[PDB]
Scaffold this active site. Structure first.
Site, PDB file in Angstrom:
ATOM      1  N   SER A 169      -8.281  10.349 -30.776  1.00  0.00           N
ATOM      2  CA  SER A 169      -8.634   9.963 -32.218  1.00  0.00           C
ATOM      3  C   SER A 169      -7.451  10.406 -33.156  1.00  0.00           C
ATOM      4  N   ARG A 228       5.859  -7.864 -18.038  1.00  0.00           N
ATOM      5  CA  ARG A 228       6.273  -7.641 -20.033  1.00  0.00           C
ATOM      6  C   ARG A 228       7.125  -7.179 -20.524  1.00  0.00           C
ATOM      7  N   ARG A 274      -4.923  -4.945 -21.239  1.00  0.00           N
ATOM      8  CA  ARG A 274      -5.413  -5.881 -20.334  1.00  0.00           C
ATOM      9  C   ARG A 274      -5.003  -6.029 -19.267  1.00  0.00           C
ATOM     10  N   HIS A 284       5.198  -4.349 -11.340  1.00  0.00           N
ATOM     11  CA  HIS A 284       4.359  -5.803 -11.565  1.00  0.00           C
ATOM     12  C   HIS A 284       4.149  -5.803 -13.413  1.00  0.00           C
ATOM     13  N   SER A 286       0.728  -1.765  -0.104  1.00  0.00           N
ATOM     14  CA  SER A 286      -0.036  -0.227  -0.189  1.00  0.00           C
ATOM     15  C   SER A 286       0.582   0.969  -0.015  1.00  0.00           C
TER      16      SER A 286
HETATM   17  C1  LIG Z   1       2.404 -15.498 -21.117  1.00  0.00           C
HETATM   18  C2  LIG Z   1       1.074 -15.034 -21.035  1.00  0.00           C
HETATM   19  C3  LIG Z   1      -0.229 -15.721 -21.866  1.00  0.00           C
HETATM   20  C4  LIG Z   1      -1.756 -14.878 -21.796  1.00  0.00           C
HETATM   21  N1  LIG Z   1      -2.185 -15.458 -21.823  1.00  0.00           N
HETATM   22  C5  LIG Z   1      -4.032 -15.024 -22.748  1.00  0.00           C
HETATM   23  C6  LIG Z   1      -4.412 -15.561 -23.299  1.00  0.00           C
HETATM   24  O1  LIG Z   1      -4.718 -16.471 -24.059  1.00  0.00           O
HETATM   25  N2  LIG Z   1      -5.708 -14.980 -23.316  1.00  0.00           N
HETATM   26  C7  LIG Z   1      -6.649 -13.693 -22.960  1.00  0.00           C
HETATM   27  O2  LIG Z   1      -7.305 -13.379 -22.931  1.00  0.00           O
HETATM   28  N3  LIG Z   1      -5.512 -13.582 -21.594  1.00  0.00           N
HETATM   29  C8  LIG Z   1      -4.096 -14.092 -22.125  1.00  0.00           C
HETATM   30  N4  LIG Z   1      -3.012 -12.994 -21.152  1.00  0.00           N
HETATM   31  C9  LIG Z   1      -3.157 -11.679 -19.798  1.00  0.00           C
HETATM   32  C10 LIG Z   1      -3.626 -12.454 -18.633  1.00  0.00           C
HETATM   33  O3  LIG Z   1      -4.271 -13.441 -18.392  1.00  0.00           O
HETATM   34  C11 LIG Z   1      -3.356 -11.170 -18.308  1.00  0.00           C
HETATM   35  O4  LIG Z   1      -5.380 -11.021 -17.887  1.00  0.00           O
HETATM   36  C12 LIG Z   1      -2.526 -10.091 -18.023  1.00  0.00           C
HETATM   37  O5  LIG Z   1      -1.844 -10.339 -18.755  1.00  0.00           O
HETATM   38  C13 LIG Z   1      -2.475  -9.378 -17.018  1.00  0.00           C
HETATM   39  O6  LIG Z   1      -3.106  -8.705 -15.822  1.00  0.00           O
HETATM   40  P1  LIG Z   1      -3.485  -8.695 -14.972  1.00  0.00           P
HETATM   41  O7  LIG Z   1      -4.844  -9.418 -14.532  1.00  0.00           O
HETATM   42  O8  LIG Z   1      -2.196  -8.806 -13.951  1.00  0.00           O
HETATM   43  O9  LIG Z   1      -3.688  -6.653 -15.155  1.00  0.00           O
HETATM   44  P2  LIG Z   1      -2.671  -6.158 -13.717  1.00  0.00           P
HETATM   45  O10 LIG Z   1      -3.319  -4.686 -14.427  1.00  0.00           O
HETATM   46  O11 LIG Z   1      -0.662  -5.788 -14.032  1.00  0.00           O
HETATM   47  O12 LIG Z   1      -1.788  -6.333 -12.567  1.00  0.00           O
HETATM   48  C14 LIG Z   1      -3.805  -6.548 -11.610  1.00  0.00           C
HETATM   49  C15 LIG Z   1      -3.346  -6.487  -9.679  1.00  0.00           C
HETATM   50  O13 LIG Z   1      -2.698  -7.452  -9.402  1.00  0.00           O
HETATM   51  C16 LIG Z   1      -1.116  -7.123  -9.409  1.00  0.00           C
HETATM   52  N5  LIG Z   1      -0.168  -8.092  -8.759  1.00  0.00           N
HETATM   53  C17 LIG Z   1       0.865  -8.432 -10.407  1.00  0.00           C
HETATM   54  N6  LIG Z   1       1.194  -9.108 -10.248  1.00  0.00           N
HETATM   55  C18 LIG Z   1       1.885  -8.915  -8.951  1.00  0.00           C
HETATM   56  C19 LIG Z   1       2.560  -9.592  -8.085  1.00  0.00           C
HETATM   57  N7  LIG Z   1       3.833 -10.014  -8.310  1.00  0.00           N
HETATM   58  N8  LIG Z   1       2.929  -8.925  -6.673  1.00  0.00           N
HETATM   59  C20 LIG Z   1       1.689  -8.581  -5.631  1.00  0.00           C
HETATM   60  N9  LIG Z   1       0.413  -7.937  -6.890  1.00  0.00           N
HETATM   61  C21 LIG Z   1       0.178  -8.334  -8.630  1.00  0.00           C
HETATM   62  C22 LIG Z   1      -1.334  -5.790  -9.487  1.00  0.00           C
HETATM   63  O14 LIG Z   1       0.359  -4.916  -8.693  1.00  0.00           O
HETATM   64  C23 LIG Z   1      -2.780  -5.119 -10.340  1.00  0.00           C
HETATM   65  O15 LIG Z   1      -2.689  -4.388  -8.444  1.00  0.00           O
HETATM   66  C24 LIG Z   1      -1.633 -13.330 -21.232  1.00  0.00           C
HETATM   67  C25 LIG Z   1      -0.494 -13.444 -20.179  1.00  0.00           C
HETATM   68  C26 LIG Z   1       0.517 -13.698 -19.911  1.00  0.00           C
HETATM   69  C27 LIG Z   1       1.846 -12.764 -19.791  1.00  0.00           C
HETATM   70  C1  LIG Z   2       4.141  -7.662   6.183  1.00  0.00           C
HETATM   71  C2  LIG Z   2       2.142  -7.352   6.088  1.00  0.00           C
HETATM   72  C3  LIG Z   2       2.321  -5.962   7.004  1.00  0.00           C
HETATM   73  C4  LIG Z   2       1.680  -4.310   6.382  1.00  0.00           C
HETATM   74  N1  LIG Z   2       1.866  -3.315   6.736  1.00  0.00           N
HETATM   75  C5  LIG Z   2       0.741  -2.347   6.659  1.00  0.00           C
HETATM   76  C6  LIG Z   2       0.516  -1.176   7.291  1.00  0.00           C
HETATM   77  O1  LIG Z   2       1.357  -0.842   8.583  1.00  0.00           O
HETATM   78  N2  LIG Z   2      -0.278  -0.215   7.024  1.00  0.00           N
HETATM   79  C7  LIG Z   2      -1.081  -0.334   5.995  1.00  0.00           C
HETATM   80  O2  LIG Z   2      -1.414   0.343   5.989  1.00  0.00           O
HETATM   81  N3  LIG Z   2      -1.009  -1.198   5.075  1.00  0.00           N
HETATM   82  C8  LIG Z   2      -0.237  -2.555   5.354  1.00  0.00           C
HETATM   83  N4  LIG Z   2      -0.065  -4.028   5.338  1.00  0.00           N
HETATM   84  C9  LIG Z   2      -1.685  -3.715   4.207  1.00  0.00           C
HETATM   85  C10 LIG Z   2      -0.653  -4.494   2.399  1.00  0.00           C
HETATM   86  O3  LIG Z   2      -0.265  -3.308   1.837  1.00  0.00           O
HETATM   87  C11 LIG Z   2      -2.759  -4.578   1.336  1.00  0.00           C
HETATM   88  O4  LIG Z   2      -2.828  -3.375   1.897  1.00  0.00           O
HETATM   89  C12 LIG Z   2      -3.040  -5.534   1.967  1.00  0.00           C
HETATM   90  O5  LIG Z   2      -2.485  -6.331   2.820  1.00  0.00           O
HETATM   91  C13 LIG Z   2      -4.468  -5.783   0.942  1.00  0.00           C
HETATM   92  O6  LIG Z   2      -3.631  -6.440  -0.127  1.00  0.00           O
HETATM   93  P1  LIG Z   2      -3.314  -6.656  -1.706  1.00  0.00           P
HETATM   94  O7  LIG Z   2      -3.287  -4.908  -1.652  1.00  0.00           O
HETATM   95  O8  LIG Z   2      -2.538  -6.781  -2.542  1.00  0.00           O
HETATM   96  O9  LIG Z   2      -4.790  -6.950  -1.884  1.00  0.00           O
HETATM   97  P2  LIG Z   2      -5.752  -8.060  -2.954  1.00  0.00           P
HETATM   98  O10 LIG Z   2      -6.877  -7.533  -3.230  1.00  0.00           O
HETATM   99  O11 LIG Z   2      -5.620  -9.366  -2.247  1.00  0.00           O
HETATM  100  O12 LIG Z   2      -5.113  -7.784  -4.597  1.00  0.00           O
HETATM  101  C14 LIG Z   2      -5.344  -7.284  -5.318  1.00  0.00           C
HETATM  102  C15 LIG Z   2      -4.790  -7.539  -6.273  1.00  0.00           C
HETATM  103  O13 LIG Z   2      -3.426  -8.023  -6.542  1.00  0.00           O
HETATM  104  C16 LIG Z   2      -3.585 -10.032  -7.004  1.00  0.00           C
HETATM  105  N5  LIG Z   2      -2.265 -10.096  -6.503  1.00  0.00           N
HETATM  106  C17 LIG Z   2      -1.621  -9.761  -5.192  1.00  0.00           C
HETATM  107  N6  LIG Z   2      -0.166 -11.052  -5.498  1.00  0.00           N
HETATM  108  C18 LIG Z   2      -0.020 -11.317  -7.020  1.00  0.00           C
HETATM  109  C19 LIG Z   2       0.670 -12.450  -6.911  1.00  0.00           C
HETATM  110  N7  LIG Z   2       1.605 -12.963  -6.019  1.00  0.00           N
HETATM  111  N8  LIG Z   2       0.542 -12.680  -8.165  1.00  0.00           N
HETATM  112  C20 LIG Z   2      -0.029 -11.713  -9.356  1.00  0.00           C
HETATM  113  N9  LIG Z   2      -1.263 -11.170  -8.611  1.00  0.00           N
HETATM  114  C21 LIG Z   2      -1.567 -11.199  -7.403  1.00  0.00           C
HETATM  115  C22 LIG Z   2      -4.520 -10.164  -6.815  1.00  0.00           C
HETATM  116  O14 LIG Z   2      -4.836 -11.195  -7.692  1.00  0.00           O
HETATM  117  C23 LIG Z   2      -5.637  -8.905  -6.746  1.00  0.00           C
HETATM  118  O15 LIG Z   2      -6.236  -9.079  -7.758  1.00  0.00           O
HETATM  119  C24 LIG Z   2       0.711  -4.877   5.650  1.00  0.00           C
HETATM  120  C25 LIG Z   2       1.412  -5.770   3.827  1.00  0.00           C
HETATM  121  C26 LIG Z   2       1.748  -7.364   5.146  1.00  0.00           C
HETATM  122  C27 LIG Z   2       1.466  -8.952   4.610  1.00  0.00           C
END
Ligand SMILES: Cc1cc2nc3c(=O)[nH]c(=O)nc-3n(C[C@H](O)[C@H](O)[C@H](O)COP(=O)(O)OP(=O)(O)OC[C@H]3O[C@@H](n4cnc5c(N)ncnc54)[C@H](O)[C@@H]3O)c2cc1C
Ligand SMILES: Cc1cc2nc3c(=O)[nH]c(=O)nc-3n(C[C@H](O)[C@H](O)[C@H](O)COP(=O)(O)OP(=O)(O)OC[C@H]3O[C@@H](n4cnc5c(N)ncnc54)[C@H](O)[C@@H]3O)c2cc1C
Ligand SMILES: Cc1cc2nc3c(=O)[nH]c(=O)nc-3n(C[C@H](O)[C@H](O)[C@H](O)COP(=O)(O)OP(=O)(O)OC[C@H]3O[C@@H](n4cnc5c(N)ncnc54)[C@H](O)[C@@H]3O)c2cc1C
Ligand SMILES: Cc1cc2nc3c(=O)[nH]c(=O)nc-3n(C[C@H](O)[C@H](O)[C@H](O)COP(=O)(O)OP(=O)(O)OC[C@H]3O[C@@H](n4cnc5c(N)ncnc54)[C@H](O)[C@@H]3O)c2cc1C
Lengths: 179, 179, 180, 180
Positions: free
Chosen positions: A88, A147, A78, A142, A55
């Site tokens: 445009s 990408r 996406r 991320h 956050s």
């Molecule tokens: C190899 C590959 C193949 C794919 N093939 C298809 C396909 O065949 N058809 C299709 O429709 N789509 C496909 N996609 C698209 C894919 O499914 C996702 O919709 C898109 O690539 C990534 O968007 P996202 O939903 O993670 O969006 P984002 O906007 O990038 O992320 C959504 C939320 O997740 C959080 N997040 C992402 N990673 C982390 C992380 N590691 N830790 C904490 N938070 C994270 C971001 O911070 C954000 O808040 C493909 C993607 C990949 C890379």
């Molecule tokens: C160690 C710890 C300490 C914290 N301390 C504080 C604090 O002091 N103050 C404070 O305000 N907040 C704190 N936080 C809260 C933290 O910052 C987040 O706001 C909270 O955990 C919600 O997580 P999120 O936003 O990823 O929510 P989520 O709703 O769980 O995730 C949002 C999106 O990100 C995607 N995503 C998450 N991880 C991945 C991933 N690995 N790969 C692909 N997509 C991913 C999810 O699928 C979802 O679509 C702390 C968290 C941790 C664990």
């Protein structure tokens, strides 16, 4: 094939001057007792990242203008955590014949009274486009890591790397991430 | 130019059989005292809508398969609250010459060893596509109301109306909304 | 402390009868060449970040916890929620709570509104909430909140959700090495 | 009770020096024919649901409220938050609170962890939080939470945000008939 900075978070609190400094400041005041606060910003932020304290990286927002094609922009679209606007620290031969042919028909269809939003449909996915891409620093992190990886296609890699260079310039986080 | 139901929320609590019934049940148990609970479901839900108590409409999720073009899907993709998947209650003359010409070059480029993801780029925005569109009932409500309005282009209106018909079938809410 | 399944995605198309079968179906019409095990396909999908096949399914759980833990759970903003209305240290927690509930009752009895009286209630007071999200969102919520760093009461609640997740999505669980 | 501006979007391009100028700039390179007033253009944009021009700007506010109201504010899930650690009815609210703070202090003094002691704190206990969102999200948050139906303490907080919004976005405020 490129990107430019359009806009970024500017704090107005005292002693916090940049977007990166606000992220580091939020980190520190979240847990004032933490001995971790005594680290350099890039040291602190490495841990915030490692602990998934996401956050603090959502106190900052950046927007970039991207120049790419309609094929790539559709893929970029996406990443739904981002906000978009549209307007445009032999193969290269047959394409050019067809592309020139499409733009001829496009320009003449408009001249014949066909509007714009109908003529648009005959354009190829190779058609250049300009979009704004806006999102928090968390989301930029991320998107860029994903990408710029092997598993994504070359022109998206280039686009994401253009974004990466701007990110590195604006944001201790680039060092924390070992970029 | 169409839509089909792929999937929807099915409750497993006792006496709640459908997605719509869970929304109405969440409404009622949120405020057990409310004399409003004595209304028909469509009566209750009209008020939930009017009061902006949106979270009850986020207990349910529906997904539709849409058949449309690449031009329209790109626009639909901008409703970022939804989740998408893509797979691999005179004018009509010149287009057909160019479209047939593009598909010829597309089919032959693949036959000449060019892969897929490069050949794709020469395809027009008029190219048909199939996507899944998934989101909560709240989000379906505001997408449908917007994209069946005057201010959106004809082929999107038709697409949204195909979605509207499925929504009306699955969901008292269609009456609450005066659809 | 606990969790209960309220509702889950069910596909209406022929040959696909569960949320997970639809997830697996989506991962299949995306494999020109990898036809290994079912859970092996999903693992592969997860590893290459193809998240959207996991966003076709959606599940709701009813959580019973404290107001304090619920406020933390509320921070997982990809989820949709619904709220409803209604050692020596262990000894003195019981007296204050009982004394807080006594005044709470008195205030309601003496006309005071529910929303004003609510403010005297401690963060330990019981609450029940719905938590709804795509299967993707559940994966990273459970993943995160079962690991050391999150506080005990929260770990327990996330382990209660994981148990339900594994029952509904046994093939994703296998893909993640999640067990009961 | 109160709100303070922490941070806001600033454009880095030539001729555009404020978040709102960037919003207005985006609405302009989207008008082939409507060149009326500046606030009149935005009103028009808002009326036709062209929301994305308002998602180019982002603002953070620091809110001071109670834990009870903060839990409600947390429900606006398009926003990003940050939390930090540290009549006769009016008479008996003061005794319990003071008595709750007394035990809280005692517990911390006698070794008990911060996260365990926190649970005895009432929903009325003060808290400060950051709330960050696009300008779009602020519009509908303020709109909603200033209108009858939301509880008094929350109306007051949303009116504190509106005051700051109007200072930063005077032309959108005009487009919405929002005044100090
Ligand atoms: C190899 C590959 C193949 C794919 N093939 C298809 C396909 O065949 N058809 C299709 O429709 N789509 C496909 N996609 C698209 C894919 O499914 C996702 O919709 C898109 O690539 C990534 O968007 P996202 O939903 O993670 O969006 P984002 O906007 O990038 O992320 C959504 C939320 O997740 C959080 N997040 C992402 N990673 C982390 C992380 N590691 N830790 C904490 N938070 C994270 C971001 O911070 C954000 O808040 C493909 C993607 C990949 C890379
Ligand atoms: C160690 C710890 C300490 C914290 N301390 C504080 C604090 O002091 N103050 C404070 O305000 N907040 C704190 N936080 C809260 C933290 O910052 C987040 O706001 C909270 O955990 C919600 O997580 P999120 O936003 O990823 O929510 P989520 O709703 O769980 O995730 C949002 C999106 O990100 C995607 N995503 C998450 N991880 C991945 C991933 N690995 N790969 C692909 N997509 C991913 C999810 O699928 C979802 O679509 C702390 C968290 C941790 C664990
Ligand atoms: C006339 C018009 C012109 C446009 N011009 C452009 C353009 O030139 N360039 C460009 O890039 N884009 C343009 N757009 C796109 C627009 O800016 C939006 O990005 C998109 O149309 C709608 O997406 P949304 O953000 O509201 O997404 P959605 O996913 O549909 O909604 C986001 C969230 O807002 C909620 N929501 C929406 N309406 C309500 C409501 N009434 N009450 C409560 N919640 C609601 C939804 O439930 C959802 O949770 C235009 C749109 C319109 C209709
Ligand atoms: C009268 C009232 C009673 C309630 N009772 C309960 C209850 O008993 N239990 C419970 O759990 N919850 C209750 N709620 C909470 C409510 O259901 C929402 O979860 C909460 O208000 C958050 O609103 P939101 O999801 O739209 O969040 P937001 O973050 O404010 O909005 C989400 C997205 O929707 C968009 N949006 C919103 N409105 C519009 C619009 N007009 N046009 C275009 N876009 C829009 C925003 O821009 C944002 O992008 C109640 C709400 C109200 C006001």
């Amino acid at each position: 094939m490129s990107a430019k900075l359009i806009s970024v978070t500017k704090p107005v609190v005292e002693g916090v001057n940049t977007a990166e400094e606000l992220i580091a400041y939020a980190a520190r005041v979240s847990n004032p007792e933490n001995q971790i606060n005594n680290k350099t910003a890039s040291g602190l932020l490495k841990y915030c990242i490692r602990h998934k304290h996401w956050s603090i990286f959502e106190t900052a927002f950046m927007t970039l203008e991207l120049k790419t094609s309609r094929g790539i922009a559709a893929q970029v679209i996406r990443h739904r955590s981002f906000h978009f606007q549209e307007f445009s620290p032999w193969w290269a031969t047959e394409q050019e014949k067809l592309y020139a042919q499409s733009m001829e028909l496009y320009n003449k269809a408009l001249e014949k009274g066909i509007a714009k939003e109908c003529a648009r449909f005959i354009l190829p996915l190779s058609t250049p486009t300009t979009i704004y891409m806006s999102g928090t620093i968390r989301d930029w992190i991320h998107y860029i890591e994903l990408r710029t990886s092997n598993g994504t296609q070359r022109e998206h890699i280039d686009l994401a790397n253009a974004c990466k260079e701007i990110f590195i310039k604006e944001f201790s986080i680039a060092k924390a991430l070992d970029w």
